[PDB]
Ligand binder design. Structure first.
Ligand SMILES: Cc1cc2nc3c(=O)[nH]c(=O)nc-3n(C[C@H](O)[C@H](O)[C@H](O)COP(=O)(O)OP(=O)(O)OC[C@H]3O[C@@H](n4cnc5c(N)ncnc54)[C@H](O)[C@@H]3O)c2cc1C
Ligand SMILES: Nc1nc2c(c(=O)[nH]1)N[C@H]1C(S)=C(S)[C@@H](COP(=O)(O)O)O[C@H]1N2
Ligand SMILES: N#Cc1cc(-c2n[nH]c(C3=CC(=O)NC(=O)C3)n2)cc(=O)[nH]1
Ligand SMILES: N#Cc1cc(-c2n[nH]c(C3=CC(=O)NC(=O)C3)n2)cc(=O)[nH]1
Ligand code: MOS
Ligand code: FES
Ligand code: FES
Ligand SMILES: [Ca+2]
Ligand SMILES: [Ca+2]
Lengths: 1293, 99, 50
């Protein structure tokens, strides 16, 4: 037993001492040195750790290939399995595989951190179906997440596998050739012959037995009843990693034939309990195609749930019994199994019973009626009978890979050929701590007939029987209760239809339709370069990100991918579990006992200063008091990351609570602000309000946002041992502040500290400053130990600690004329800033600067206050205050259109600034291109024709509605504090004529280096192949501003341009002497002549300096503009919606790189759609974050993007204010995602006209994010009415 | 540096040229990505030639800092450097010498 | 230089040099070398990619 034998990329791995707790991901990265596979979450949600597995299935008698999450796969499941990673399929040193080639060339990689896992999911699909359909392609990625690209290019590139200039050329794509694929390991195929036998692995804490036969299993369960069964590990892996469970003995029964058999019996189809859900799915799909519809009703319910269950990676290893016996209250399968009386065959040594799953099977929270000795052997999913119908429904926060809010299985059985109920079973997850049946509601209906009175009685019974108290776990009380009724209504209508053969009642028919995909259409339009332009001048051409091929191949190095020194140690942060408390004591005595423990570090250990933060506001380690959940108190350093983690968990802090201030409200009421009010007032408000026809006032809320960069925060710190010198490798946008905060903490000169940033797997503003929280702790550990130290955050630590977007609460009042013309406006903004100042003040300023969006408002006053709270300090997040303000502006604008009873686009247009007007902060709008963007987008989106189609759809549909909205945006370009708008560059030309460029900016996926290389190559008139950018470092370019504010291309581009001019001046006399020579000849002659081939370049943005007191002076150098039109369809019974189509026209001047600029448009767009419709953080009332991972925090998925998605870059709009006539692009488009939100609002208005109102001018409040909860609850109807807010003796009037 | 005291001499030289103490100056190492195309450290001329290179770079820093010295004659080195930074004056340069 | 800590995956190189002042290289035999515990490879002119 002892030996574990498997294959990785064709090469045998004999592991003599497998520890059962070792996951594949850890083994690949730390033992095999294969760092292409990444950690992104550790909980099976993001797919960054996706690999392929292949084995001989001796039962199908066939090599099978499936994908799996390496972060959840125990190496101890992999005996005799071949693993293929991203490095297994190609590389830039050999040849890219078609999958890697295409994702790179089609601009499907930006930061590149998600790329290997998406490569591996597409590769896996291809090894199963070398010519897949478009849908099989989209479905390949239910478990992969990308934060950068907005998904469109990845899909559009991979679509070339199925069946204006252009951003890519599919005709240059090498065809797939399956004869050239790596051969299944021949040794492994020799081994399929030998009968398997029980294996035993022993690790630090856990013993694992791999059971080869059912008799072995049942003997082992008799001998060790406490032993924990593991198959897919997709639940146990979580319990171990996230709930600190330890199961000292594991039995894995996955190999046993009876636990994997599938039998087709007279009564149904029977699956062994170890059958993966992907096998279950394939078998049922085949049954559903082969058999009469009336036999397959239950099967189709199972299928409908499996469609929305995790993703391919999870479904391929997750077992059927694993789902049933886990008994999560939110199982999507157990409600269906229970509604159906699905048959469980349950065995122990010398016992066998078969029971119908029913409501008694789950007696209580996480328990089942299996005894200690008993295993679930097999499950029989039944055939449907005549007169028997079945539905299953799941509603979540997001449709793809999410955890159910309410989930259900519904069965009715009628007397033969009648509408008279013989049996009825309504079974729900998410309504209690176990899967429950509404037996009281359903008992009342036996013998009753399927009619309106029955529907009404069941709704009323559901409302009574499935009550939730205000304190219920999960909250969303009214939504959850509405959903139990709504789902029944859908079932009730579906059953009416199925009862009447197969026109019965249109208007209602769509409520009965299962989710369905329209095919994708995507058009990108951009400008060709002037005809005569050199092929070597790539400026304005769609050149792929220079690192894209290496991102696809797994060869790009991110911080944690850098190899460890042999004496390198690992840091784990110890953080506050309380919102606001004195630290009474800290006890490390249990931590000292974990193996490999090295030290616990705290405030006393710091040799320099404990005062850190942008405003010197913060501690490096908390001293005396904690002021948030997640406040860093200390750190454990140990020999492995698991030892550090375990040790930190068992560090005991004793606190005495202090009164907390968590919400904006609390903070207002308690006068808890940073600094004093900010304001911009222009004109005369009283006079304005007195002259307005109408005045609307209200209150608006926008929730925050977690950056979810696919690479979390990560620092390596190398102490040199000499003069306090230290060298750090850091995932940060701000090498400058990292360098100086590390020097300040150590108490050494800044010249001692070298910070190097190669690349980030995303930053989005979240690495603008908060990265120093980890950097400075790791530095302290390096200084204290004298060893290299590193730490990469797990997702959950990252989300808790490092801060996010600012929540905003607005109180506004707008005065306007009957024509819609805005006459006066006041908005008071309040942001939730958390426990330090950080970038909050500058964030508020940027909010105030954008409170106008694109609208001329003669009398305007905006104020902002920063709320000081006991929450992790919030920071920059793409848009940097802009999107909050701009969302507030569009909310009141939309209320203006409604109140006037005018078309929203008319009201927006007539209010829109024109060429040369001043903003509310008295900046002139020069080259204001919003009217052209607006006009072109109306037209290319066919807005007016589509309006009329949306009304028509709404007339014809009672339980679904469409919505359509077109919104502008403008976004000011510069840092608003004048000093940051400076940039340096350093350029060397070596004597072979190769050029190395260095500049102060960092690469986080936005293609800054690629752009800098395009610039240098145009400036110097050499090909880009001769130019190279290695990294960003503080000893090449000092005092750099963070890479931020979307100006990096602008300002580094100019600094690189200027160093190129100096080089060209130095070379000019060599050019003169030898006009016909090469670049190489000129360089060598200047070297031979002792002319320096090295220079700096520098740039400082002219004419900036806004004053809040004079309300004058340029806040920005210019503005970036665009317009988006989005259409949605909502499901008014559930709160799900589809994004049908979006069209965007964006003015980015003459693009440096339209591939990259469109990528930025679509990525920003999709990040804003997430903010406005999907993504929501929840905190307990005492301030502890609930949503700490992709299971609960739902960013846009592949399936979330607009099905038709069109992006155009404005033609013929050169920007004389920036390098080569281009414009900043990184943040401006993100607020365009709000068109989705406003389309949703339009569709809610429609639903409320259907079933709420005769009031066309009514204004209901819709806060952001418009999640299914808020959309559903807003669709007020006869079902909401039955389950609202919380018979009295006792009624006045 | 091979024992001959070249980094030391260079710090002495920069300190004299900038009129700040040697304690505010540091030389960490030699690398091809900070100074390209270097001749070998050889022929006993390294002090002579890197001395002038360091000295010319120090002159350039002094020219850039002068308006701030002028505005604030009583200030510290640290005051003048911060002012130049806040005013977006570059605080990096090359230096070069040809015998 | 050698005081710099080694990476966990860092390997060691030993040069193989001629014992003759002027001679043709007839053959090179690495088969006893491969037997030595920890041998990774022997490098020679043919391995050079440039
Ligand atoms: C990213 C992600 C998304 C997910 N999405 C969903 C979803 O949408 N809906 C949903 O319902 N679930 C979801 N899950 C839950 C999980 O994937 C399923 O419960 C899965 O079926 C568990 O199977 P497993 O083989 O991995 O169980 P394991 O983790 O291997 O085992 C879980 C439990 O089952 C017991 N067990 C396993 N086999 C037997 C047996 N034969 N006899 C007795 N006990 C046994 C084990 O002892 C253990 O307690 C998701 C999980 C992840 C990680
Ligand atoms: N792929 C990718 N695009 C991105 C980001 C990122 O981290 N990854 N950050 C955004 C933010 S917050 C900013 S301010 C800019 C920074 O880059 P720039 O100044 O070169 O546009 O890029 C934007 N686009
Ligand atoms: N993107 C992003 C985004 C970032 C910033 C910004 N980043 N750092 C700062 C600082 C502000 C300050 O007052 N003091 C400092 O030392 C730094 N501002 C401004 C913006 O308009 N967009
Ligand atoms: N000390 C020492 C010492 C060294 C040298 C010297 N070093 N390199 C060369 C080269 C000569 C040449 O033709 N091509 C080259 O690339 C180099 N000369 C001169 C000396 O006077 N003292
Ligand atoms: O960094 Mo940018 S918000
Ligand atoms: S790291 Fe495995 S799914 Fe995220
Ligand atoms: S490219 Fe997908 S997360 Fe950055
Ligand atoms: Ca963050
Ligand atoms: Ca803050």
């Amino acid at each position: 037993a002892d030996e574990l034998v498997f294959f990785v990329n064709g090469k045998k791995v004999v592991e003599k001492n497998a520890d059962p707790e070792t996951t594949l991901l850890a083994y690949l990265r730390r033992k095999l040195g294969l760092r292409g596979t990444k950690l992104g979450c550790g909980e099976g949600g993001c797919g960054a750790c996706t690999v392929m597995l292949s084995k001989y299935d001796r039962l199908q008698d066939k090599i099978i290939h499936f994908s799996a999450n390496a972060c959840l796969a125990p190496i101890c499941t992999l005996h005799h399995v071949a693993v293929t990673t991203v490095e297994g399929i190609g590389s830039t040193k050999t040849r890219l595989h078609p999958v890697q080639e295409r994702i790179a060339k089609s601009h499907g990689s930006q930061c590149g951190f998600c790329t290997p896992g998406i490569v591996m999911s597409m590769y896996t699909l291809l090894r199963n179906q070398p010519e897949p359909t478009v849908e099989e392609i989209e479905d390949a990625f239910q478990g992969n997440l990308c934060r950068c690209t907005g998904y469109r290019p990845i899909l559009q590139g991979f679509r070339t596998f199925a069946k204006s200039p252009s951003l890519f050329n599919p005709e240059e794509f090498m065809p797939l050739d399956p004869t050239q694929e790596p051969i299944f390991p021949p040794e492994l195929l020799r081994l399929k012959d030998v009968p398997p036998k029980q294996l035993r692995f022993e690790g630090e804490r856990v013993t694992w037995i791999q059971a080869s036969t059912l008799k072995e299993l049942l003997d082992l369960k008799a001998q060790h009843p406490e032993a924990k069964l593991v198959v897919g590990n997709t639940e146990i892996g979580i319990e171990m990693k996230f709930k600190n469970q330890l199961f000292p003995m594991i039995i894995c029964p996955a190999w046993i034939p009876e636990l994997n058999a599938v039998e087709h019996g007279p009564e149904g189809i029977s699956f062994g309990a170890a059958c993966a859900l992907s096998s279950v799915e394939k078998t049922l799909l085949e049954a559903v195609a082969k058999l009469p519809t009336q036999k397959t009703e239950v099967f189709r319910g199972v299928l409908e749930q499996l469609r929305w269950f995790a993703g391919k990676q999870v479904k391929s290893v997750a077992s059927l019994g694993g789902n049933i016996i886990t008994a999560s209250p939110i199982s999507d399968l157990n409600p269906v199994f229970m509604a159906s009386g699905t048959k469980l065959t349950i065995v122990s040594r010398g016992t066998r019973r078969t029971v119908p799953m029913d409501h008694t099977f789950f007696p209580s929270y996480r328990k089942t009626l299996l005894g200690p000795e008993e295993i679930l052997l097999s499950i029989e999913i039944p055939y449907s009978r005549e007169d028997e119908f079945f539905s299953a429904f799941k509603q979540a926060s997001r449709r793809e890979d999410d955890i159910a809010k309410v989930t259900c299985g519904m069965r009715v059985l009628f007397q033969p050929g009648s509408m008279q109920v013989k049996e009825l079973a309504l079974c729900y997850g998410g309504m209690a701590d176990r899967t429950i049946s509404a037996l009281k509601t359903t008992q009342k209906q036996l013998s009753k007939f399927w009619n309106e009175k029955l529907l009404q009685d069941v709704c009323a019974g559901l409302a009574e029987e499935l009550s939730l108290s205000p304190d219920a776990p999960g909250g969303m009380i009214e939504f959850r209760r509405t959903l139990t009724l709504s789902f029944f209504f859908k079932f009730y209508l579906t059953v009416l239809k199925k009862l009447g053969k197969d026109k019965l009642d249109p208007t209602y028919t769509s409520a009965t339709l299962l989710f369905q995909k329209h095919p994708p259409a995507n058009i990108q339009l951009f400008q060709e370069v002037p005809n005569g332009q050199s092929k070597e001048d790539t400026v304005g051409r769609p050149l792929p990100h220079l690192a894209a091929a290496m991102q696809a191949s797994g060869e790009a190095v991110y911080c944690d991918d850098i190899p460890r020194y042999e004496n390198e140690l690992f840091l784990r942060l110890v953080t506050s579990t309380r919102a606001h408390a004195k630290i009474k004591s800290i006890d490390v005595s249990e931590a000292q006992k974990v193996p490999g423990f090295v030290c616990f570090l705290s405030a006393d250990d710091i040799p320099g200063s404990n005062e850190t933060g942008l405003f010197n506001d913060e501690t490096v380690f908390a001293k005396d008091t904690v002021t948030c959940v997640g406040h860093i108190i200390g750190a454990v350093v140990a020999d492995t990351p698991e030892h550090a983690e375990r040790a930190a968990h068992v560090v005991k802090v004793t606190y005495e609570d202090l009164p907390a201030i968590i919400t904006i409200e609390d903070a207002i009421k308690n006068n808890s602000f940073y600094g004093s009010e900010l304001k911009i007032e222009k004109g005369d408000l009283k006079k304005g309000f007195s002259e307005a026809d109408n005045v609307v006032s209200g209150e608006l809320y926008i929730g925050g946002q977690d950056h979810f960069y696919l690479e979390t925060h990560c620092t390596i710190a190398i102490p040199k041992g000499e003069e306090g010198e230290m060298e750090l490798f850091v995932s940060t946008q701000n090498a400058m502040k990292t360098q100086s905060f590390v020097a300040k903490m150590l108490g050494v000169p800044v010249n001692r500290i070298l910070v190097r940033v190669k690349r980030m797997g995303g930053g989005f503003g979240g690495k603008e400053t908060r990265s120093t929280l980890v950097s400075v702790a790791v530095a302290l550990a390096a200084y204290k130990t004298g060893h290299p130290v590193r730490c990469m955050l797990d997702r959950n630590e990252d989300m808790l600690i490092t801060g996010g977007r600012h929540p905003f609460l607005a109180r506004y009042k707008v005065g306007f004329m009957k024509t819609g013309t805005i006459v006066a406006l006041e908005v008071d903004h309040y942001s939730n800033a958390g426990n330090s100042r950080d970038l909050s003040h500058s964030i508020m300023e940027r909010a105030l600067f954008h409170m106008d969006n694109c609208y001329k408002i003669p009398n305007i006053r905006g104020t902002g206050r920063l709320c000081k709270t006991n929450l992790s300090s919030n920071t920059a997040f793409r848009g940097f205050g802009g999107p909050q303000a701009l969302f507030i502006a569009e909310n009141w604008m939309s209320e203006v259109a409604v109140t006037c009873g005018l078309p929203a686009e008319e009201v927006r247009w007539k209010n829109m600034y024109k060429e040369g007007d001043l903003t509310h902060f008295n900046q002139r709008l020069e080259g204001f291109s919003v009217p052209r963007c607006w006009d072109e987008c109306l037209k290319s989106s066919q807005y007016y024709a589509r309006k009329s189609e949306v009304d028509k759809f709404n007339k014809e549909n009672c339980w679904k509605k469409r919505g359509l909205c077109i919104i502008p945006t403008k976004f000011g370009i510069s840092f608003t504090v004048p000093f940051l708008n400076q940039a340096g560059a350093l350029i060397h030309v070596y004597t072979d004529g190769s050029v190395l460029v260095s500049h102060g900016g960092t690469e986080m996926g936005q293609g800054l280096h690629t752009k800098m290389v395009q610039v240098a190559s145009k400036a110097l008139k050499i090909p880009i192949s001769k130019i190279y950018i290695s990294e960003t470092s503080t000893n090449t370019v000092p005092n750099s501003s963070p890479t931020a504010a979307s100006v990096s291309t602008d300002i580094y581009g100019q600094a690189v341009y200027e160093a190129c001019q100096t080089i060209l001046k130095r070379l000019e006399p060599f050019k003169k002497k030898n006009p016909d020579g090469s670049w190489e000849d000129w360089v060598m002659a200047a070297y031979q002549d002792r002319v320096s081939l090295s220079t700096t370049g520098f740039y400082r943005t002219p004419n900036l300096g806004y004053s809040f007191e004079t309300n004058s002076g340029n806040a920005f150098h210019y503005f970036t503009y665009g317009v988006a039109c989005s259409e949605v369809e909502i499901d008014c019974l559930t709160g799900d919606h589809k994004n049908l189509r979006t069209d965007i026209v964006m003015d980015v001047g003459s693009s440096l790189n339209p591939a990259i600029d469109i990528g930025q448009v679509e990525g920003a767009f999709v990040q804003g759609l997430g903010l406005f419709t999907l993504e929501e953080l929840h905190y307990s009332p005492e301030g502890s974050l609930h949503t700490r991972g992709p299971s609960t925090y739902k960013i846009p998925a592949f399936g979330s993007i607009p099905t038709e998605f069109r992006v155009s870059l404005l033609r013929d709009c050169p920007n004389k204010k920036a390098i080569y006539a281009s414009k900043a692009v990184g943040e401006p488009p993100l607020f365009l995602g709000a068109s989705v939100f406003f389309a949703i609002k339009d569709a809610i208005r429609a639903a409320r006209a259907q079933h709420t109102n005769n009031n066309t001018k009514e204004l209901f409040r819709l806060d952001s994010p418009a999640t299914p909860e808020k959309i559903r609850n807003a669709c007020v109807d006869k079902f909401t009415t039955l389950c609202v807010t919380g018979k009295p003796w006792s009624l006045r009037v």
